[PDB]
Amino acid sequence: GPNICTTRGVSSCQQCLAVSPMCAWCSDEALPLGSPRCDLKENLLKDNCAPESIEFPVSEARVLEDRPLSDKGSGDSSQVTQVSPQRIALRLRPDDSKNFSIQVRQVEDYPVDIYYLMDLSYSMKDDLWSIQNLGTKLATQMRKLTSNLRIGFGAFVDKPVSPYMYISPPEALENPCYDMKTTCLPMFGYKHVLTLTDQVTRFNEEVKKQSVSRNRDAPEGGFDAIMQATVCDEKIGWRNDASHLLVFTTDAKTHIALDGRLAGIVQPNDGQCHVGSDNHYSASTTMDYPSLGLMTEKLSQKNINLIFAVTENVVNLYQNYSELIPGTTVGVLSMDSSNVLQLIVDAYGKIRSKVELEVRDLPEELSLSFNATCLNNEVIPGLKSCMGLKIGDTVSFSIEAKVRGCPQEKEKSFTIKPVGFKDSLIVQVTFDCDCACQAQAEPNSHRCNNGNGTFECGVCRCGPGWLGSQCECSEEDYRPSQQDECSPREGQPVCSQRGECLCGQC
Amino acid sequence: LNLDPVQLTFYAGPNGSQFGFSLDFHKDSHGRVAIVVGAPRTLGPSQEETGGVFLCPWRAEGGQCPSLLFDLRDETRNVGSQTLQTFKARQGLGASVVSWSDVIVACAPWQHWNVLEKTEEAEKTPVGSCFLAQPESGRRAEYSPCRGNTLSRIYVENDFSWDKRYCEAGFSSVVTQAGELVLGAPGGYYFLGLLAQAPVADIFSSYRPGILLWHVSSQSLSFDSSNPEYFDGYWGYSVAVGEFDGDLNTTEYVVGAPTWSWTLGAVEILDSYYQRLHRLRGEQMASYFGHSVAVTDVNGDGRHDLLVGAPLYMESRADRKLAEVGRVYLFLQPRGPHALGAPSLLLTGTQLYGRFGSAIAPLGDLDRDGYNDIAVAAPYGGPSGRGQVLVFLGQSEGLRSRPSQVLDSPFPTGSAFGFSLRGAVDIDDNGYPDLIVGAYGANQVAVYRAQPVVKASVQLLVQDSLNPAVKSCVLPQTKTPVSCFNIQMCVGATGHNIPQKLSLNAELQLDRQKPRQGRRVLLLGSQQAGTTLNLDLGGKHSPICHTTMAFLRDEADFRDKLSPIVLSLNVSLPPTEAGMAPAVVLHGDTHVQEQTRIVL
Numbered sequence A: 001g002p003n004i005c006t007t008r009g010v011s012s013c014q015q016c017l018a019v020s021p022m023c024a025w026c027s028d029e030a031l032p033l034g035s036p037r038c039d040l041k042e043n044l045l046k047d048n049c050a051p052e053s054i055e056f057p058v059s060e061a062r063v064l065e066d067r068p069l070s071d072k073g074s075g076d077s078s079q080v081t082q083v084s085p086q087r088i089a090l091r092l093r094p095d096d097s098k099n100f101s102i103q104v105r106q107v108e109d110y111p112v113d114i115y116y117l118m119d120l121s122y123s124m125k126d127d128l129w130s131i132q133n134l135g136t137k138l139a140t141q142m143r144k145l146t147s148n149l150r151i152g153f154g155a156f157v158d159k160p161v162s163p164y165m166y167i168s169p170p171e172a173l174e175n176p177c178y179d180m181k182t183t184c185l186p187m188f189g190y191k192h193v194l195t196l197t198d199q200v201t202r203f204n205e206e207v208k209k210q211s212v213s214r215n216r217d218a219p220e221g222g223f224d225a226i227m228q229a230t231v232c233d234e235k236i237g238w239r240n241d242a243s244h245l246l247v248f249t250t251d252a253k254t255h256i257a258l259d260g261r262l263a264g265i266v267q268p269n270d271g272q273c274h275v276g277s278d279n280h281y282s283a284s285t286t287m288d289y290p291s292l293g294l295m296t297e298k299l300s301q302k303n304i305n306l307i308f309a310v311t312e313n314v315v316n317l318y319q320n321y322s323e324l325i326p327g328t329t330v331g332v333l334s335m336d337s338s339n340v341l342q343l344i345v346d347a348y349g350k351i352r353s354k355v356e357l358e359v360r361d362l363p364e365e366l367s368l369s370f371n372a373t374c375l376n377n378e379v380i381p382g383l384k385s386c387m388g389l390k391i392g393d394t395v396s397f398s399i400e401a402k403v404r405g406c407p408q409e410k411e412k413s414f415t416i417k418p419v420g421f422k423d424s425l426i427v428q429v430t431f432d433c434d435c436a437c438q439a440q441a442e443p444n445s446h447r448c449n450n451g452n453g454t455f456e457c458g459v460c461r462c463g464p465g466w467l468g469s470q471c472e473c474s475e476e477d478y479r480p481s482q483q484d485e486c487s488p489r490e491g492q493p494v495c496s497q498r499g500e501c502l503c504g505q506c
Numbered sequence B: 001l002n003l004d005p006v007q008l009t010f011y012a013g014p015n016g017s018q019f020g021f022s023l024d025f026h027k028d029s030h031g032r033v034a035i036v037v038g039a040p041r042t043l044g045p046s047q048e049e050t051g052g053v054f055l056c057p058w059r060a061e062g063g064q065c066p067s068l069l070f071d072l073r074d075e076t077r078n079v080g081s082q083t084l085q086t087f088k089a090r091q092g093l094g095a096s097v098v099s100w101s102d103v104i105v106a107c108a109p110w111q112h113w114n115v116l117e118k119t120e121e122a123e124k125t126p127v128g129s130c131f132l133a134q135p136e137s138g139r140r141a142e143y144s145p146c147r148g149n150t151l152s153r154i155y156v157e158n159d160f161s162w163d164k165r166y167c168e169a170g171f172s173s174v175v176t177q178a179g180e181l182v183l184g185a186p187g188g189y190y191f192l193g194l195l196a197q198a199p200v201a202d203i204f205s206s207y208r209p210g211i212l213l214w215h216v217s218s219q220s221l222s223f224d225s226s227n228p229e230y231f232d233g234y235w236g237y238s239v240a241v242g243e244f245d246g247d248l249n250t251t252e253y254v255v256g257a258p259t260w261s262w263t264l265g266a267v268e269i270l271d272s273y274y275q276r277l278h279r280l281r282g283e284q285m286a287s288y289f290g291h292s293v294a295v296t297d298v299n300g301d302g303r304h305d306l307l308v309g310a311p312l313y314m315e316s317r318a319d320r321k322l323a324e325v326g327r328v329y330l331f332l333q334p335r336g337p338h339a340l341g342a343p344s345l346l347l348t349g350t351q352l353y354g355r356f357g358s359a360i361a362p363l364g365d366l367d368r369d370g371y372n373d374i375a376v377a378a379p380y381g382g383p384s385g386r387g388q389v390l391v392f393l394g395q396s397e398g399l400r401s402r403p404s405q406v407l408d409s410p411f412p413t414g415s416a417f418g419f420s421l422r423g424a425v426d427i428d429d430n431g432y433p434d435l436i437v438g439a440y441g442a443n444q445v446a447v448y449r450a451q452p453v454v455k456a457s458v459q460l461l462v463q464d465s466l467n468p469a470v471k472s473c474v475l476p477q478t479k480t481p482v483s484c485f486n487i488q489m490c491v492g493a494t495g496h497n498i499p500q501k502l503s504l505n506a507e508l509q510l511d512r513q514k515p516r517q518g519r520r521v522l523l524l525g526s527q528q529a530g531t532t533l534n535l536d537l538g539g540k541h542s543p544i545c546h547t548t549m550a551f552l553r554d555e556a557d558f559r560d561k562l563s564p565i566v567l568s569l570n571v572s573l574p575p576t577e578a579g580m581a582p583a584v585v586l587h588g589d590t591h592v593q594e595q596t597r598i599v600l
């Protein structure tokens, strides 16, 4: 009677449930009139239309894998749980929304992977001298924060191509700093020096065999190094069960995409691994610099926290870059990088002091709402990130998934994942826009003009010729009605000259 | 809207030559329009990727093009104690081609130059050079404003002041109406950004073959700046000319500095003396605001409007909040000279990493509606990421936020379809400006031709005999006197260069709301509510008129007499799409509703 459920037509079961969640459909053979077999559940029940045949799908969110959150990540890193639930099954009927929860906890003794991406330009010659014993000093300071630390080293200057590199005279190619009467290394784009290893003494050995180079322009090809350090997992040596810190140390500006046109390079960065067996970025002279969007995507894809260890003269520039790249922090590096050890420890604490959610493979018809609940019981709504946390905290994010209309795939899955963590919640969406009566799928039967209309879910759905209650109009259904029901049997014209043949009724 | 995407002309250069990197229209003395296409990686005589320029004559089928020959030999002249040297290997001849009158200006931004003087040298730096050429007369000239004989030592003592060694002049080139060639040198003044301008007539008259370092007495260059905002700004990445200060005796330059003020980007408008009049700051960091600029009057107020492309702009999608789509900014020039403010329109791309705004081409009046139109390209946009060109139409308040047409890349993936765009030139002389799209990845250029636009004029005149109480008009088969009315329908087709074979189909409709069985009004010829007529409006300026006779049922026949009578007239092109591509684009009121009602 009341509510749009009754007013918005009848058609079949597909139409009436597709309007609004409350609406229900009766498929069994019952009173032809009364309930438009499309009213609410209690109205339909009121008309006794449920011989255990009432159709009314309900949106549900049932978990599948619900391993509890781990308390310490020191041992059995493959069995460290930082997100619960890990997998849920979500059923959504059209235009309906169901809410679910996800607890994120950052364990204490989680393994850490620190890759030191050092700008080996000439202005960082003194910086290279303050790093000779960084590996030993880094292990001691990281000892209290983790029991499994791996460190690696990589270097970059810029693209080895004019005008970035001096090309004259021929002695300036094998020694770019000939004219200040010094010996340097030939310009390189990005060389991978040390694979991520737990033996921290290798970092000290490999860092004192490095030498700086000399380029011409102020900006450096650092984003090229960040891309290659991110996408070359097997070469750099990232671990799945570890935190990934990419310490990016530089003192000058950085080249961005479309800056490679100055050197004659127009081919965009494809985000692939181009480091060969010689540990050199082989596509540095043939491929443009990566853009912020592409670089951000690969950082999120590989779960890498990027740290800008930049000097004071470019601290504001990279602080503005960090606002566009999630999961990144900026530290003020010294002119000789004498405090990079304290910068890494502070950045790791700063990075782990914030938990930010990230959704991937979200269907275009799904809309998510996050109510962040940080320390204490502050349910800050509309926020998918908590800030000000510490190591060991357990935040919770209530999420509401709303679907516009009804997608035809009826089976989609997306993942909700904290930034920089492998652990994720896999949500399996199972849209329910069809009834159980459609499983029968009754074809044209004798109840619809002896085989002129499908008898599915009680109401005879049938082609434009034969319409009406019994799908027998054979014409339009209005003036000719379906079976001249307006004229009861014979001797009674259009309901005794009261109701004519209109709207397919007396 | 008009650009035919089915009949495409494909000009192909040598494979692996980036044929299509830069393209422009060239007009001969006879008026024939040719296409000059830059191929900055064409193999030189010694199998080195020097570069090349192809002059493509206009053909419907297209194909290979003749090569415009330039000097591709390295030069070495000993003047005084110095030794001037030019290195044309990998110079990228064709990275910027612009045509003015009978002169074609092909630039090589990456041509190197060194000055040896005993042990000291000036360093082999990509000073950049531009080769001017008159194809109809064979006159060849060069313009390298950033060549110098100053040794490196001197620059070090001067803190690299006036260091035009890394100019890369020709990166972006434009010629003003008077004939002043304005070259863009983003690497000038130690990558600060430079702009060099010299008349084309004076370049030809001053160029002496064999002389490598010479000064054009009428040239002018921008000024080096100590402001840290300009450092590494690449001021000169894109250059455009226009009128932005009132009087038309002075031309104004529009210079794109995509990395101005720490990769923020800016677009400055300056007079002929490089005095900044107005600066437009970028909106997002590293968005490359200023990678492409274009000056055209889109809103038809008589005052030029500025369009700025930001190919790497990242939008807030509320699901990712940073999606690299690209954006184009539109600035409408107000009444006051120095009054440009916030952008009047923000055209944002939709495909991720599509680089929307990488090329903006003023198309002129594409549909001839009285307002100029533009075409923005996404070289890696589209659902398949192969390239897209989007056509935007001008209007009274600026541009349409919605593209009137989308051109998908006919070339495979990675062709960078849309990197170079050029329009507002009628290459087939059909009265409508066309568009040439360059895909250097495929080493091919696509030519899109604008087919004519027909402005439909539908007028259905129906007699007001909608009351059935008259019962006077009779039926041919049986008198049955009923209040019938005549249906006079007229259709008008207006548009420039409309073909004489245009045969529109007019679909009449009577009592549209009622079903076919319940049709109250019928004709007296076929007794069917509504009919289809194939009027041949092509070749007839008159709004062809024709009257038809229709009758209504009896009073008792329609119990729902109260219901209104809906008369509709729909016109559309003839169903000849399968036989041939639609020779016209029907624009205007295609369908008209002549709704009436029964009174008596």
Ligand SMILES: *[C@@H]1O[C@H](CO)[C@@H](O[C@@H]2O[C@H](CO)[C@@H](O[C@@H]3O[C@H](CO)[C@@H](O)[C@H](O)[C@@H]3O)[C@H](O)[C@H]2NC(C)=O)[C@H](O)[C@H]1NC(C)=O
Pocket: A316, A317, A318, A320, B261, B262, B264
């Ligand atoms: C990083 O981004 C910030 C903005 O988020 C940059 O600072 C901003 O710089 C602009 C000038 O480029 C300042 O604009 C001026 O502000 C004054 C005072 O409000 C106003 O009177 C002027 O008309 C003009 O708007 C702006 O205030 C300033 N914002 C802040 C918060 O300081 C910063 O320079 C960027 N760092 C880089 C690029 O390294």
Ligand SMILES: *[C@@H]1O[C@H](CO)[C@@H](O[C@@H]2O[C@H](CO)[C@@H](O[C@@H]3O[C@H](CO)[C@@H](O)[C@H](O)[C@@H]3O)[C@H](O)[C@H]2NC(C)=O)[C@H](O)[C@H]1NC(C)=O
Pocket: A099, A369, A370, A371, A381, A382, A398, A399, A400
């Ligand atoms: C995030 O938090 C907000 C605020 O708590 C949630 O929305 C609110 O949820 C409550 C409980 O469902 C709604 O309460 C009900 O409102 C109706 C009127 O709309 C009233 O008749 C009921 O008696 C009851 O008070 C409340 O309206 C709703 N507010 C809004 C603006 O929608 C939201 O659902 C939370 N999201 C997640 C992901 O959990």
Ligand SMILES: *[C@@H]1O[C@H](CO)[C@@H](O)[C@H](O)[C@H]1NC(C)=O
Pocket: A061, A099, A100, A101, A398
């Ligand atoms: C959805 O929100 C309501 C109201 O806050 C709450 O009672 C219910 O438990 C939530 N459901 C889930 C699965 O979070």
Ligand SMILES: *[C@@H]1O[C@H](CO)[C@@H](O)[C@H](O)[C@H]1NC(C)=O
Pocket: B247, B248, B249
């Ligand atoms: C522009 O130059 C013409 C030259 O014929 C002159 O007549 C006119 O006054 C000038 N307009 C100015 C200076 O505004």
Ligand SMILES: [Ca+2]
Pocket: A123, A124, A125, A126, A127, A335, A336, A337
């Ligand atoms: Ca230093």
Ligand SMILES: [Ca+2]
Pocket: A157, A158, A164, A215, A216, A217, A218, A219, A220, A221
């Ligand atoms: Ca550099």
Ligand SMILES: [Ca+2]
Pocket: B243, B244, B245, B246, B247, B248, B249, B250, B251, B252
């Ligand atoms: Ca002027």
Ligand SMILES: [Ca+2]
Pocket: B297, B298, B299, B300, B301, B302, B303, B304, B305, B332, B333
């Ligand atoms: Ca204007």
Ligand SMILES: [Ca+2]
Pocket: B364, B365, B366, B367, B368, B369, B370, B371, B372, B373, B393, B394
């Ligand atoms: Ca127009």
Ligand SMILES: [Ca+2]
Pocket: B425, B426, B427, B428, B429, B430, B431, B432, B433, B434, B449, B450
């Ligand atoms: Ca044309």
Ligand SMILES: [Mg+2]
Pocket: A121, A122, A123, A124, A218, A220, A251, A252
């Ligand atoms: Mg440096």
